């Protein structure tokens, strides 16, 4: 919910090939600092992946699902076990259908049209994706109209430019290709690099 | 016949959650053949005794069903 | 209502076969926990693939049935 | 209407954190030079504040309500006797029900889909938002298939970008932060700057 | 029709003012090397050029119909012997319309949303239109999520861009005034141009 | 039958009025509340006359309509 | 027909209510407009909130008459 | 009363068909108009021909739906 | 009903009104192969203008049809 987005102001994004480099680099990148990861469905057998992750559950990781564009990949998602769901887009049906699991579920939106159909649905934390066509202006010039919205930009988010976004006043931001590639051991250091420097913008 | 729909309804909706849980256990038993662990098992163990439940309940709304269009 | 009986019949041979199946799985998962192997995991695999075809054709058969019924 | 953007070619768009700085700004805008102004439903009592300055009417002022996104507050506008309806996006349903009271809607689009939709429901003069993050390039790229459609941008317009904005072909700029910031006499200031920009470029 | 796509990799987005014109130039890209073209719907009399240009059609060229908005002109298009049709935007009747008619339709999109709406409808090869507000950073991007997809980016396309948006990974490009402004014979050394450079690189 | 739903039309065309009506009433008395003035209070009494011609077309209606249902 | 004419007489008890309540707000207007006051000012507050929620309350009200006639 | 209307059908396939062909028919003249040739004259000599068939289909099934009419 | 087959008395007389103007049109192409004039095109542009009117025409009577058919 807002909470752990506000606390925690991180969300590692795994892409993988397979099944057990998502499991050693979520885990690596528990061990930089960020609680909060997402598990995309790209990622083959990537509900097994968030079952097999109890162990970080009750250690305080809370993982979720992304890339989810249907309501089956929702259902099984909940039932292994993820906390919350993302989309890289906007479905009325994947959150009518979530509203009433009682699940969290942040869409993505990249145009004030989308924004206003999800504020419509009851969201008001998006995800701002691609969040590097857009830039921080976007997130700026939707204060004045949209004063409620926040939003969590995934995609082109660097050190150089991670302070540029919260100082035009996101939420979180998600963070994909700058933590997770490269060896397992590599990723445990970009994290505390990401985690140092955000609490030193 | 509404009787007869509600339960043609629940019957649907356990259908759909075992058609999940079936997916879930085929995706984690794909993991075990690549990389084998006994925690994974244990979870394996979990989700067929689930399934199990979910039969059972199938099957009880199913003869409801059947007394009920006799 | 033959049309609807005979669908009914159809479900339930197909519960009994998935009944039965899922059984099966538990068991050999259960004989995979004491001493694992990699034809155990194969013929798993199988027996889970197998379980997929029965939810689907019993899917079918059930929305087949509902149409009838609405 | 076509016409009053075709002459004035400049919009204030009016934001204020309560109403008498709401209506001292539109009397300092309508000193500069000025006779198109909205203000946003996201000043408090703002449908009062249209009301209020009614006096301006018969010096010349076209006034109009902005950031509408209920059929409610299109009703509530109308009532206090807003000349024109702004929306920072596309709605289907005001669009319907604003033509059936012969009242100028101008909706917010973003991408090419939105604008069909939008033509499709009748709209030959579309709100650009967010500007800065489409560019005047959005603007020339949209002559070559769609002809027709005329362009008020609104988003990051300045004393600088307005002649690119201007050679790129769109009907009037709604002008907000650069514009309506600061003292009331320094509003006033600005005003005749950006008159006196856009009618040398 | 994605291996034409594939093979060609380039796409002449024909507009004009005349049916002459569009017929002179048509014949000029044709002789540079380029086998797809298309003829946009806002050339006078469109479909009588695609009628008229049937005598290409037996050398190996490839006519397809732009910038249709409405299904009578996908019908009209068809009828006049047009092999592909093509849009700046998506529209579910066109699509759904032109399914049925087994004819090979590629929608424009600018957001993920409408990408996943279009994905939705069966449309794996996309129009990405205005490839230039968005740029081959829209491309990488997208590949993550959705790696079954591919883009023909219309808008903006130089001699000095082209290989930046091959390398982003697009299937073909569409090039319209960096290659049909001019005489009928510097449209013929454009078009050898961007042959020979998209060959190169 | 029709005259019916016609009134009932009508009526809820006026209410959708008076609810609009009353909500810039009330954001002018808040208005006023703060920065005083003779305009406003003209206006304000411009308002009052309206919402009451609005409630006399009201129970005109309702009152017809009551005579029907009778 | 006996919870339509129930819902016509709660509906015309709102209205003789409202109407009542828009005569007192005129009556209070005129008075401030002679001599300003800040009280004044809050007691017609207080009439408009009342207002407000006798509107809502007719409003209420009619989709339910409404519904039951449909 | 089903044959009238899937005869309805088939006249409204071949009328939007007509209306097409007659909007290229007139683009294809006026081209010609502007830039004469004689391939233009064979290709609007083609399409008349398609018109003309077009024409005796529809005719051909009204004969019938107005058989069925009677 | 009478209205029905009015309806279909007025399509058969608009159908061979265009069979009539096609006809024309053909003629009139074949004349214009055989030795082009300008003349010619203009009033091959009028027979193809009034060939429009009347598919129009035709249009807007089997929309009244099918609207009294379904
Ligand atoms: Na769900
Ligand atoms: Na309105
Ligand atoms: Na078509």
Redesign the interface.
């Known amino acids: 919910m807002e909470e752990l987005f506000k606390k925690h102001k991180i969300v590692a994004v795994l892409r993988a090939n397979d099944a057990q480099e998502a499991r050693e680099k979520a885990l690596a990148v528990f061990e930089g600092g960020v609680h909060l990861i997402e598990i995309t469905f790209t990622v083959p057998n990537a509900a097994a992946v968030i079952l097999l992750l109890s162990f970080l559950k009750e250690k305080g990781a809370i993982i979720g699902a992304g890339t989810v564009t249907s309501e089956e990949q929702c259902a099984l998602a909940v039932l292994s076990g993820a906390e919350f769901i993302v989309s890289p887009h906007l479905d009325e049906e994947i959150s009518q259908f979530c509203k009433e699991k009682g699940v969290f579920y942040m869409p993505g939106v990249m145009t004030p049209t989308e924004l206003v159909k999800a504020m419509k649905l009851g969201h008001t934390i998006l995800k701002l994706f691609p969040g590097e066509v857009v830039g921080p202006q976007f997130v700026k010039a939707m204060k004045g109209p949209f004063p409620n919205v926040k939003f969590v930009p995934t995609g082109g988010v660097n050190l150089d430019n991670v302070c540029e976004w919260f100082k035009a006043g996101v939420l979180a931001v998600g963070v994909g290709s700058a933590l997770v590639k490269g060896t397992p051991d590599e990723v445990r250091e970009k994290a505390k690099a990401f985690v140092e420097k955000i609490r030193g913008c | 016949?509404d009787e007869?729909?509600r339960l043609?309804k629940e019957?649907?909706e356990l259908?759909?959650?075992?058609?999940?849980?079936?997916?879930?256990?085929?995706?984690?038993?794909?993991?075990?053949?690549?990389?084998?662990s006994d925690?994974?098992?244990?979870?394996?163990?979990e989700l067929?005794?689930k399934?199990?439940e979910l039969?059972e309940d199938?099957?009880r709304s199913?003869k409801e069903?059947?007394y009920i269009?006799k």
């Open positions: 016949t007869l729909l043609a019957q649907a259908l759909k959650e075992i058609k999940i849980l079936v997916e879930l256990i085929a995706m984690l038993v794909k993991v075990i053949q690549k990389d084998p925690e994974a098992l244990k979870a394996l163990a067929v005794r399934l199990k039969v199938m099957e199913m069903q059947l269009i």
